[PDB]
Design a protein around this ligand. Structure first.
Ligand SMILES: CCC1=C(C)/C(=C/C2=NC(=C\c3[nH]c(/C=C4\NC(=O)[C@H](C)[C@H]4CC)c(C)c3CCC(=O)O)/C(CCC(=O)O)=C2C)NC1=O
Ligand SMILES: CCC1=C(C)/C(=C/C2=NC(=C\c3[nH]c(/C=C4\NC(=O)[C@H](C)[C@H]4CC)c(C)c3CCC(=O)O)/C(CCC(=O)O)=C2C)NC1=O
Ligand SMILES: CCC1=C(C)/C(=C/C2=NC(=C\c3[nH]c(/C=C4\NC(=O)[C@H](C)[C@H]4CC)c(C)c3CCC(=O)O)/C(CCC(=O)O)=C2C)NC1=O
Ligand SMILES: CCC1=C(C)/C(=C/C2=NC(=C\c3[nH]c(/C=C4\NC(=O)[C@H](C)[C@H]4CC)c(C)c3CCC(=O)O)/C(CCC(=O)O)=C2C)NC1=O
Ligand SMILES: CCC1=C(C)/C(=C/C2=NC(=C\c3[nH]c(/C=C4\NC(=O)[C@H](C)[C@H]4CC)c(C)c3CCC(=O)O)/C(CCC(=O)O)=C2C)NC1=O
Ligand SMILES: CCC1=C(C)/C(=C/C2=NC(=C\c3[nH]c(/C=C4\NC(=O)[C@H](C)[C@H]4CC)c(C)c3CCC(=O)O)/C(CCC(=O)O)=C2C)NC1=O
Ligand SMILES: CCC1=C(C)/C(=C/C2=NC(=C\c3[nH]c(/C=C4\NC(=O)[C@H](C)[C@H]4CC)c(C)c3CCC(=O)O)/C(CCC(=O)O)=C2C)NC1=O
Ligand SMILES: CCC1=C(C)/C(=C/C2=NC(=C\c3[nH]c(/C=C4\NC(=O)[C@H](C)[C@H]4CC)c(C)c3CCC(=O)O)/C(CCC(=O)O)=C2C)NC1=O
Ligand SMILES: CCC1=C(C)/C(=C/C2=NC(=C\c3[nH]c(/C=C4\NC(=O)[C@H](C)[C@H]4CC)c(C)c3CCC(=O)O)/C(CCC(=O)O)=C2C)NC1=O
Ligand SMILES: CCC1=C(C)/C(=C/C2=NC(=C\c3[nH]c(/C=C4\NC(=O)[C@H](C)[C@H]4CC)c(C)c3CCC(=O)O)/C(CCC(=O)O)=C2C)NC1=O
Ligand SMILES: CCC1=C(C)/C(=C/C2=NC(=C\c3[nH]c(/C=C4\NC(=O)[C@H](C)[C@H]4CC)c(C)c3CCC(=O)O)/C(CCC(=O)O)=C2C)NC1=O
Lengths: 48, 161, 160, 96, 48, 96, 161, 161, 160, 161, 161, 161
């Protein structure tokens, strides 16, 4: 049983969302750098 | 996939043989147990949820597995684990109806050992979850079907270890 | 089989076998004993069916056993009956399973391309199969002859 | 290690048992350790004696098929019992 | 709220994912563009 | 197809030219291949002098097989067939 | 390799299970057929050469295979072929004693399909040589052992095709 | 891919050289054989099907390959095999027009050896199918083109072995 | 087993089993029910054997459950007896197999390297293993106690 | 990926620890530098193109690299190289905002060393292109942010070598 | 293999350049950290066994990995795993002395990912074993050497994932 | 390997034919050119070193190949290259004596194309090194032997391209 394998990897699955990641993951999907408006949001979140 | 009957047909097809006495005897040995397989599947299907709950209760929860640091900690992972359990139960029911384990290889075991190694999923603990569902199943289905259901749970569990 | 065409279908939707779906998984089981018996009967007379099919074929289409014919000659005719023996075998397989399934993979998918290469006239292979229906059917009870006949007409259909 | 084995005992390793013997000897002893097992085996002595120089004894199927196999195989795979027309036209011509 | 079930074909299995399991991961950026309307001719697109 | 699919999703997926799904699905249904107990990349090319070995990073085409520890590899004999030693235990002393 | 007694132990060890009732039943099912396996092996071993001779006569020689252009042409290749035949017979006898096909995979089938493709060795013709030896074996060993010997010849032959 | 002409351009581009006398001589050696390549392609294309049929007849069918246990047994696999044959013929015709084998590497040979090992496809038998199509091609295309067509069939066949 | 060890000799010489090899399989299998009873008795008393082995061990060498001892503390002790439980299990396996193949691959090959790393004192461990013999042997008939005792003395031997 | 706020949570979650004083101190050490990270990102983003231009001018072009035989010869490859440069700059800006290098591993370094070996892309030359962009960045962002931006460029460059 | 110094020499040799100011600056940047590398190696070497023990204790044992069904179950495999660990530690110490990761590619990473896939060795679990040894190492070697040792452990671990 | 004479013997052996008129004519066509082959081999052998030196001088050195960045840069690689050259010359001399190219396939070409791709060895440049040695050889051996020596150099060079 089990005649072949394709191997295994090092998956990292996400436990929870956490704001820094949501913003950053969001920017990547658009491949862009923080928007002029978007930068402000990090400050409030950093700010609190 | 293949079942009892197509296992025989393909074994003869590659030799280009019409079915002979030995073949016909094998197929009879399947047909003669067929009605019992059906009844057993209807018990498993209709008790699906209770089998998982009793199997988890005997072999998984009330433990370090469900506590912080454990692989079935978080509602997310607890859900994924009993989701898996349902797959096993459901496919074993297919294998037992077909009277052939080939579907358990094609659609369940292939790559699964390494998938579990890659995620960190505890193999030994999963086997106990399989052998606990077997225990429950063997009570519910009765003398007629107990041995026949059991083997495909045992196929599943030696496929991981 | 009937099973294959069936457990795989109620697994494309991730569920257990439907209570009506374990009923097609019931007619076939009863049918299978009869189905197994018909295949055995067909297997017993295989040499007679092929040979008499081969005579019926060459009367109806003498052109294939003629100067510019695909089956012209003693060993071009020997291979032709061997192909008729192949298809009778596949017909016994189809009957027993209750579903055509394996026969398709073994002898119709790719058959156009195979025979076009060999330059074999496909429609006269379909005739050879009708000829086998006629012989085989004369060795079976009315009810069993019909059940067998569906699988002969399928092969005739697929070579088309 | 696998390559060194082909040079000192003329064949490739057969197994993981064998491969592992050396892999876990090389981690304690090094290059020198590994060399000294291929050289000191029982198999070295049965086969190469003490005067024969080692030679190539076995090949893998991939390796054999690169020496030959360019140009395919000339042959036709025959079968016992087949109905075949090969060579009948030629025989017919000689008769004529 | 259900398990998202992903439907197969005669060759490969149907699988489901627990709903809360996809809700604790990064939420999917997608890009869509209109449906074009019907006032006169073509879409407009009616996008920014 | 977990492992293979994960590779396909990487951005280095087009750097591999050997097919991986058709080859993987076919392996599942066949007996073990003959290759080294570790990877397919672990046995060198069989020529006169090199130590050749394929790369991994260079144009990746990894192929692994779950290989046992008691699997013993089938090797062709560079010599006559019946001195193979797996069927004739003292075939290395017979002739040349 | 593994045998029925050993397989039961390693299949349970990976789950860390004591041998339980299901395990003990499997092992009994082996022990209870054991004496018959031994008698069958003694018949095969002592008729080895005659089985090969009768199997070759029904399925290989008197043919294009043994004629110029054929793969068992030349005394060299004829010798290699019946040498192979002896391997198959001998190992199938091991598998049947062990009541486990794992040895046929580890020491016979692994790489053999491609080895034969690389040398040009006709696969279909070799299978017939296997299924002819089975036919002879099943006569010699009798009712007691016929089905049990037969399966490991069938394991061998679907391993090549 | 590259042809004769782009082979030269890219070899000089990496050195940033304008084409010199040696380059110009190579390109002439291609152009001067060009009309003959075209005529040869039109013969191969228009006799495609007959070349495959005569090549299969001399090197593949009437054999164990087409019998049960053989790799071109079943209409499915017979179709796949002569499908392959058409690829080879068609691409060799491209290589010969281009006067460069690079397309045979990029779009035909890459991974094919292992693909065939993985499916069980007999390599030696496939080479004979290639060298039989070459034989037929060399008759049909005539003195003008025989050697030039031939080499890309030989490229294909040493690419597998 | 005896089978695994012996068949291996058959296959390696490309041959069927000898009369001798067949005879030993027969004598071996005849001694099955008894071996199974020996394993059952010991499986049935495992917790007692381990615990009483553990007392016998710490008297004969306590220092291991002391400030600078490898097994000092409640959970450093929970592991030493667990290892004693492991080896008793392997001893039951060996007895039913009639040789050490399984015992060896599972718990002696690599054991020096494992324990040297952990700096568990291995030689104390041999004495601990020896104690289990004393307890287990007191729950078996003279004849069965000897048969069991060979496998205990093997492990004691392999350690060192 | 993970960031300083997220890493503190997952590092504690695997131990099942509430955030305690040590954790809370780490998070403060991030929040207290946060406004400065934002300002620095706005400088880098808005000077992106000039940073690449000045970094290429000091460390890549006017050289054998841009000449025939060089890896950034051809408009195709010159474009690919400064495309890469933009990735590095952009991701380093992400890492510095997040205060965690994990994104540089997950989405930039993984497999990149071998990808460059396979294409022939000169590693040492690429590192100089990274350390030249760092030099420019450290001038533009000022005392506040210089050290913090710099480290993720240094992370990138020891990831290749 | 290559170190800091030969990395520079070979980069200039292919251009046939005498060492210039930029080269000489790089070599200085190595020599100036050299004494610290040596001290760090002497700490690692002399604490080798304790580092493995503490790294295994934090990241491998007391788990499903060491239980039946786990890859480091059996004294054989436990020994193989900590044997591997010693390789990693030892080679990382070489890489850090050399100030170049090239040895980690040539003699450790090449083919290792697939070797582990082929045996079933859990990759993610092995990375944690690497990053736990790094954690221990960084305490033992002190401020002077912590960052420099650390990078070659990080090189190793992104080489597997 | 095979020569002219064994090429014929093996072609007839597979048909089990005694040598007939057509065979005997072929063998004569070899024997009748035999003395000339020997004289030619004695010229090549005794001028071996001068042929390599004149072939390298016309087709390899005084070039980018021997300069930094070139494949025959370093005394190591220059030595490996003219070592190779000696192989080619020596084996071509064997092929020409045997009157059969089969040895050039078995012991020289098999795998060599990919070996050169894997090391980076320039194929086109190596062919010119072969065709330059042919040019020199054809002068030294004279009218008698020029065409016959030449073909096995041409066999070698279309074996790489
Ligand atoms: C942080 C988000 C989160 C929560 C809360 C969570 C809970 C959770 N509660 C469980 C059980 C349980 N939980 C409770 C009780 C209760 N639970 C309550 O929130 C009440 C205070 C109380 C009822 C008044 C009981 C009695 C069980 C045993 C399960 C059973 O009924 O058999 C289990 C099954 C394993 C176990 O026994 O611990 C999980 C996974 N998982 C999560 O990921
Ligand atoms: C149709 C056949 C089929 C099977 C069987 C299957 C299994 C499977 N289990 C998975 C994860 C998982 N599996 C489990 C299972 C368990 N956790 C435990 O602690 C227990 C030991 C065990 C339950 C008894 C857990 C917890 C995860 C989540 C891992 C993660 O967080 O990423 C995943 C990863 C994708 C996902 O999360 O859904 C797959 C594909 N997939 C398939 O397509
Ligand atoms: C018996 C038959 C046989 C042949 C022909 C053979 C060729 C061969 N050439 C090699 C390398 C090589 N071959 C060359 C050849 C050249 N460099 C150039 O620039 C020129 C274009 C060309 C000379 C005309 C060079 C430079 C290397 C070294 C590559 C390296 O540095 O690794 C190697 C690698 C092992 C080694 O370095 O020795 C082999 C096996 N081996 C054999 O067993
Ligand atoms: C211990 C397990 C084991 C097996 C089974 C085995 C098979 C095997 N058969 C071989 C060759 C062969 N095998 C055959 C077999 C046949 N010829 C036919 O036409 C028939 C169809 C068939 C016999 C029924 C022949 C003719 C060769 C020689 C091929 C050659 O000339 O190179 C070779 C190549 C080395 C050699 O020639 O000895 C191996 C390794 N090797 C092993 O180690
Ligand atoms: C070119 C290399 C080569 C040789 C020599 C060869 C011999 C050969 N001799 C055979 C039979 C035979 N050969 C003989 C020969 C003899 N009987 C005697 O008593 C005398 C001592 C001897 C005549 C001088 C006999 C009687 C048989 C029939 C044996 C049988 O059918 O059992 C067969 C089996 C029949 C067949 O299929 O052809 C082969 C293959 N095959 C080869 O490939
Ligand atoms: C089980 C699936 C299956 C089938 C059916 C099959 C057929 C098949 N028919 C063949 C030839 C043939 N088949 C025929 C058949 C006919 N000639 C006529 O005119 C009639 C229309 C027809 C008889 C009813 C003839 C005449 C040949 C010889 C053609 C040739 O050699 O060119 C061949 C090539 C010879 C060989 O190597 O066996 C194959 C493979 N192969 C398969 O794997
Ligand atoms: C079935 C084959 C097998 C064995 C035997 C085995 C033993 C084993 N013993 C261990 C520890 C241990 N074992 C002992 C045992 C002892 N201390 C003493 O002084 C005495 C000499 C001895 C008791 C008789 C102790 C004290 C530890 C803890 C050592 C530590 O944590 O550093 C550990 C590490 C803890 C763990 O992760 O489980 C393993 C794996 N593992 C295996 O796979
Ligand atoms: C074969 C494909 C190809 C091209 C075309 C190419 C062009 C190219 N032009 C360059 C510079 C340049 N090119 C120019 C060209 C001009 N200045 C003007 O105002 C005019 C519009 C124009 C002349 C018609 C100038 C002035 C520079 C210097 C710019 C600088 O150094 O900042 C450079 C950087 C210097 C170097 O490292 O070589 C490259 C790579 N590279 C290539 O690989
Ligand atoms: C999102 C993260 C990410 C990165 C970083 C990335 C790098 C990357 N660089 C590539 C090629 C390349 N990279 C370069 C880079 C350079 N050339 C030089 O000489 C310099 C030393 C250097 C610039 C400083 C060049 C020239 C190529 C083209 C190679 C070719 O011609 O195939 C390729 C191959 C596919 C393509 O050509 O686009 C990838 C994937 N891919 C990714 O997905
Ligand atoms: C010099 C550089 C070098 C390295 C690094 C190397 C690794 C390596 N690890 C191996 C096996 C292994 N590696 C491990 C490792 C582990 N098990 C686990 O569960 C953990 C996740 C992990 C330890 C942290 C295990 C358990 C095996 C044995 C697999 C088997 O049973 O076959 C093997 C197979 C041969 C053998 O068993 O010795 C090699 C070659 N070989 C080398 O030459
Ligand atoms: C860095 C390692 C290295 C070295 C040293 C090297 C030397 C080298 N010296 C050469 C020629 C030469 N070298 C010399 C040298 C001398 N003549 C004398 O009488 C004196 C004894 C000596 C000067 C001290 C001469 C005269 C030639 C021309 C020989 C010819 O063309 O036949 C050539 C061929 C011309 C070329 O293509 O460059 C090379 C490759 N190549 C290398 O890769």
């Amino acid at each position: 049983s089990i005649r072949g394998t394709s191997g295994s990897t090092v998956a990292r699955p996400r436990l929870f969302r956490t704001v820094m990641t949501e913003t950053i993951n969001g920017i990547n999907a658009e491949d862009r750098y923080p928007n002029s408006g978007e930068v402000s949001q990090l400050d409030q979140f950093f700010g609190d | 996939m293949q079942d009892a009957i197509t296992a025989v047909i393909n074994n003869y097809d590659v030799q280009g043989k019409y079915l002979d006495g030995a073949a016909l005897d094998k197929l009879k040995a399947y047909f003669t147990t067929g009605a019992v397989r059906v009844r057993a599947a209807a018990v498993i299907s209709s008790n699906a949820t209770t089998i998982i709950k009793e199997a988890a209760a005997k072999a998984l929860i009330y433990s370090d597995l469900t506590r912080p640091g454990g692989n079935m900690y978080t509602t997310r992972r607890y859900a994924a684990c009993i989701r898996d359990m349902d797959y096993f139960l459901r496919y074993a029911t297919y294998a037992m109806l077909a009277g052939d384990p080939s579907i358990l290889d094609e659609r369940v075991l292939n790559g699964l050992k390494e998938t579990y190694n890659s995620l960190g999923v505890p193999i030994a603990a999963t086997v106990g979850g399989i052998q606990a569902m077997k225990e429950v199943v063997g009570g519910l289905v009765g003398p007629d079907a107990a041995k026949e259901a059991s083997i495909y749970f045992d196929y599943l569990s030696s496929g991981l270890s | 089989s009937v099973l294959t065409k069936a457990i795989v279908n109620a697994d494309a939707e991730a569920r257990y076998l439907s209570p009506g779906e374990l009923d097609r998984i019931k007619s076939f089981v009863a049918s299978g004993e009869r189905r197994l018996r018909i295949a055995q009967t067909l297997t017993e007379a295989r040499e007679r069916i092929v040979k008499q099919a081969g005579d019926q074929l060459f009367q109806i289409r003498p052109d294939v056993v003629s100067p510019g014919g695909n089956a012209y000659g003693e060993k071009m005719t020997a291979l032709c009956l061997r192909d008729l023996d192949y298809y009778l075998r596949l017909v016994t397989y189809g009957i027993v399973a209750g579903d055509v399934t394996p026969i398709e993979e073994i002898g119709i998918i790719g058959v156009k391309e195979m025979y076009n290469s060999l330059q074999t006239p496909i429609p006269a292979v379909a005739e050879g199969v009708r000829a086998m229906k006629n012989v085989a059917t004369s060795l079976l009870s009315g009810d069993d002859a019909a059940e067998a006949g569906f699988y002969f007409d399928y092969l005739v259909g697929a070579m088309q | 290690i696998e390559y060194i084995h082909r040079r000192l005992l003329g064949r490739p390793t057969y197994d993981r048992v064998e491969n592992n013997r050396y892999f876990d000897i090389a981690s304690k002893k090094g290059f020198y350790g590994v060399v000294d097992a291929m050289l000191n085996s029982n198999e070295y002595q049965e086969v190469f004696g003490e005067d024969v120089l080692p030679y190539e004894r076995y090949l893998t199927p991939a390796g054999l098929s690169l020496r030959k196999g360019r140009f395919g195989s000339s042959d036709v795979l025959t079968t016992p019992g087949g109905i075949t027309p090969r060579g009948d036209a030629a025989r017919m011509m000689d008769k004529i | 709220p259900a398990d998202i079930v992903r439907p197969s074909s005669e060759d490969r299995p149907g699988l489901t994912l627990p709903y809360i399991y996809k809700l604790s991961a990064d939420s999917l950026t997608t890009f869509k563009m209109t449906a074009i309307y019907g006032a006169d001719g073509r879409p407009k697109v009616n996008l920014s | 197809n977990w492992g293979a699919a994960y590779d396909l999703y990487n951005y280095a997926a087009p750097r591999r030219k050997v097919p991986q799904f058709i080859t993987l699905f076919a392996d599942y249904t066949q007996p073990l291949p003959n290759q080294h107990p570790y990877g397919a990349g672990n046995d060198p090319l069989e020529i006169q002098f090199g130590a050749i070995f394929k790369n991994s990073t260079i144009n990746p085409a990894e192929r692994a097989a779950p290989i046992g520890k008691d699997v013993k590899r089938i090797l062709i004999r560079n010599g006559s067939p019946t001195s193979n030693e797996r069927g004739n235990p003292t075939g290395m002393s017979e002739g040349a």
